[PDB]
Nucleic acid binder design. Structure first.
Lengths: 74, 83, 82, 90, 74, 71, 79, 162
RNA sequence: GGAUUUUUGGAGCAGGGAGAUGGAAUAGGAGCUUGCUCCGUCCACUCCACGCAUCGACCUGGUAUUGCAGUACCUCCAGGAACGGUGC
């Protein structure tokens, strides 16, 4: 058991992640984790008005991860 | 250690299916990767949600935590799924 | 110690189960598993602001059950002895 | 190991309810407070109690409060939010 | 300073007046009496606080880990 | 003990109620430890929605009852 | 490949101020310096502050033991 | 070969092309449609094609009945209690029937949920102003004989015989 | 076998403001029926901030495609917005 998610093809690629409460971030993944935790370096989050705010390297847990869409062709 | 709906979802990889999330998002396309924990990774996917925002993306990945249901074709419901 | 062995020994008893959404299902408990899978026969379910409906069989999960209601003539002192 | 942790941790606050036969209150997530004597407990906070009194407040959908009594009931540990022990049986 | 693990910090916080706030907005302030390994809390002479206003005293209060959001040692 | 509660309703049409208020009426073919239901040629009522073979997860299941005779 | 546990250990060793967002709560977040961590992502913030984005206020609490089941996103700030 | 409970329990039931539960009761030559209580409203469509039913009546209360196939029959009269037994009846195929007068379409106006009606290959359709009378008597029907009802046809039906 | 993807739950609660606007056939209290006055529950219309923007389904008119396939959905233009959900 405890199989890690297949995130080897999405390594070092710019993807957009969706978090609970209607949150949207975009950034390049820098690693993987068996608990679905993603490290996004130089991430930019979308605000409510539509402006993008750069938050840098952030860590998103798997408990609030909704959907991750790869914006680059892998 | 592997369930029969998990085996039916793993055997249906490569067909035009859809996955409806708990928030209503329907990721439709060819199931490229289907793990044992309902992790659906699709290529050339399409987002048709309960919000209705229909778009086309190159690659999508929906985990089994927020996945509500999965709509699969009836090509694998005859054999070897007959028990 | 374990409440699953006490809940599994409560078969053939007319009890009630109230869910988290306000739906109350009253019926005779016929089957209880280790995951608290309550399989009842000839139950009556009343949802929130809805009419009660009678069903010949019902299967409620353990995670969806919020509270239970047992009759006053239930031997809880004798059933607690493992 | 398990018995010492149950008799020395927070579960001892449950174990004082069944040994001395005291009355405790349980506030659930449905805005309901049930006061009663805890008869059976477990590691997953499965509380089987007897002679419980549950009070809450409801709107017509001004609102108003209400209360009811049950002879014997059983509640799972998932819906139990707050558990308060107070000397109310004396 | 030195990196302290949360389990000796919770073991050493027993007997001190702290306040544990839940996800519903209500907080319980009192002396921490019991803290197990499953992040469960049992306090004595607890007082309830809602929206920055005190509600009343309850005594021994048991709060589980599924509902408690944060805890602050006063 | 016997664990025949889910095996007796195999290959039969059952209607499962979801947590959000939806009802899926389909032929239950197999199950698992996580209560994963596979409903072949299922209908969604809340209006009628053509779904077909719908594999609903066990986390969004509330109650299930018998709908009719097996086809 | 950068592990999240290694990034959390580097953030605890650097003692930088980080902001933690709550799960299903976008109005209020926390901010503080993480001193230690565990396997359940339990953060120990020293001189923490709860920032409400709706009211534009900040309330300090001090030593806070935040559980990992509520923290959804964590970002590093310069303040 | 009357319609009984043993004939309904031995009949085939499956999914149709519209993903609805349909029971194939064709090839039975039932003179009267009765004993439908054994299905217990578990079918969304009723396939009663190629039968000898004379009157479309005698049906119990079935809230799940939404489609009724009465093609290739000898139906010449409609029951007045069709709305009390099928409140959700939306599809009614009565092609190649024995309806001669428009007065048999008067109990069909009680079905408020009926939207698709087929009255082709019938002597009642060959009468003068049959489509206008069917549009005036049944305003809830949107598709009549595989044709969408327009606003001009509704105005012509509301103008005459007002 | 209660610590992130299933079973000891992060769930609960409330629908913006105003107007000498309108109704409780049989169901509010008080000034101790009826008539009148006051106050903590909806729907219809009007005004400010058609609550806002988004896409999907859908109706009218015009318009293009005549094509042999196993399907989230399928031409375009303009008007109206009865429906769904997303963020404030």
């Amino acid at each position: 058991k405890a199989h890690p998610p297949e995130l080897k093809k999405f390594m070092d690629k710019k993807l957009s992640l969706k978090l609970n409460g209607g949150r949207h971030v975009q950034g390049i993944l820098r690693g993987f984790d068996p608990f679905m935790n993603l490290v996004i370096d130089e991430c930019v989050e979308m605000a409510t008005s539509g402006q993008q705010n750069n938050i840098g390297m952030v860590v998103i847990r798997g408990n609030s991860i909704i959907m991750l869409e790869a914006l680059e062709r892998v | 250690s592997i369930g029969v709906p998990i085996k039916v979802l793993h055997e249906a990889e490569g067909h035009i299916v859809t996955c409806e999330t708990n928030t209503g998002e329907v990721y439709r396309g060819k199931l490229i990767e289907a793990e044992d924990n309902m992790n659906c990774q699709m290529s050339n996917i399409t987002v048709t949600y309960r919000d209705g925002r229909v778009a086309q993306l190159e690659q999508v990945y929906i985990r089994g935590s927020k996945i509500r249901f999965l709509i699969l074709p009836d090509m694998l419901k005859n054999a070897p799924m007959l028990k | 110690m374990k409440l699953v062995r006490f809940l599994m020994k409560l078969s053939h008893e007319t009890v009630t189960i109230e869910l988290k959404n306000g739906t109350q299902v009253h019926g005779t408990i016929t089957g209880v598993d280790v995951s608290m899978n309550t399989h009842l026969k000839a139950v009556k379910m009343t949802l929130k602001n809805r009419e009660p409906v009678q069903l010949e069989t019902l299967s409620i999960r353990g995670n969806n059950i919020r509270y239970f209601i047992l009759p006053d003539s239930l031997p809880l002192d004798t059933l607690l002895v493992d | 190991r398990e018995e010492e942790e149950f008799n020395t941790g927070p579960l001892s606050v449950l174990t004082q309810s069944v040994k001395n036969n005291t009355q405790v209150l349980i506030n659930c997530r449905n805005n309901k407070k049930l006061l009663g004597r805890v008869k059976a407990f477990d590691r997953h906070c499965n509380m089987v109690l007897e002679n419980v009194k549950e009070m809450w407040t409801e709107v017509p959908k001004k609102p108003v409060n209400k209360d009811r009594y049950i002879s014997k009931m059983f509640l799972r540990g998932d819906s139990v939010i707050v558990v308060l022990r107070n000397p109310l049986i004396a | 300073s030195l990196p302290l693990n949360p389990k000796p910090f919770l073991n050493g916080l027993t007997g001190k007046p702290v306040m544990v706030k839940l996800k519903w907005g209500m907080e319980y302030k009192g002396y921490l009496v019991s803290v197990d390994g499953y992040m469960n809390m049992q306090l004595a002479n607890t007082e309830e606080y809602i929206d920055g206003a005190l509600s009343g005293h309850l005594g021994e209060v048991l709060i589980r880990c599924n509902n408690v959001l944060y805890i602050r040692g006063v | 003990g016997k664990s025949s509660k889910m095996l007796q309703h195999i290959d039969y049409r059952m209607r499962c109620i979801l947590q959000d208020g939806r009802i899926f009426i389909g032929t239950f073919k197999a199950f698992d430890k996580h209560m994963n239901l596979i409903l072949c040629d299922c209908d969604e009522f809340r209006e009628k929605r053509v779904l077909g073979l719908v594999l609903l997860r066990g986390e969004n299941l509330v109650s299930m009852t018998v709908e009719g005779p097996p086809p | 490949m950068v592990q999240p546990i290694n990034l959390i250990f580097r953030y605890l060793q650097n003692r930088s101020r980080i902001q933690v967002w709550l799960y299903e709560q976008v109005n209020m977040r926390i901010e503080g310096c993480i001193i230690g961590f565990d396997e359940y992502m339990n953060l120990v913030l020293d001189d923490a502050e709860e920032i409400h984005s709706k009211t534009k206020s900040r309330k300090q609490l001090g030593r806070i033991m935040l559980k990992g089941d509520n923290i959804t996103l964590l970002q590093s700030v310069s303040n | 070969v009357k319609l009984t409970a043993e004939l309904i329990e031995q009949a085939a039931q499956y999914t149709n092309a519209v993903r609805d539960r349909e029971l194939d009761l064709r090839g039975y030559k039932i003179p009267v449609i009765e004993n439908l209580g054994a299905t217990l409203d578990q079918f969304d469509a009723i396939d009663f094609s190629d039968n000898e039913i004379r009157k479309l009546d005698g049906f119990p209360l079935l809230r799940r009945l939404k489609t009724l196939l009465v093609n290739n029959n000898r139906i010449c009269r409609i029951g007045e209690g069709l709305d009390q037994a099928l409140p959700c009846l939306t599809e009614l195929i009565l092609t190649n029937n024995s309806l001669v007068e428009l007065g048999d379409l008067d109990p069909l106006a009680s079905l408020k949920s009926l939207t698709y009606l087929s009255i082709l290959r019938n002597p009642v359709t060959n009468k003068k102003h049959y489509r206008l009378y069917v549009i005036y008597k049944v305003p809830q029907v949107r598709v009549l004989d595989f044709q969408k009802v327009k606003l001009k046809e509704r105005q012509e039906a509301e103008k005459m015989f007002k």
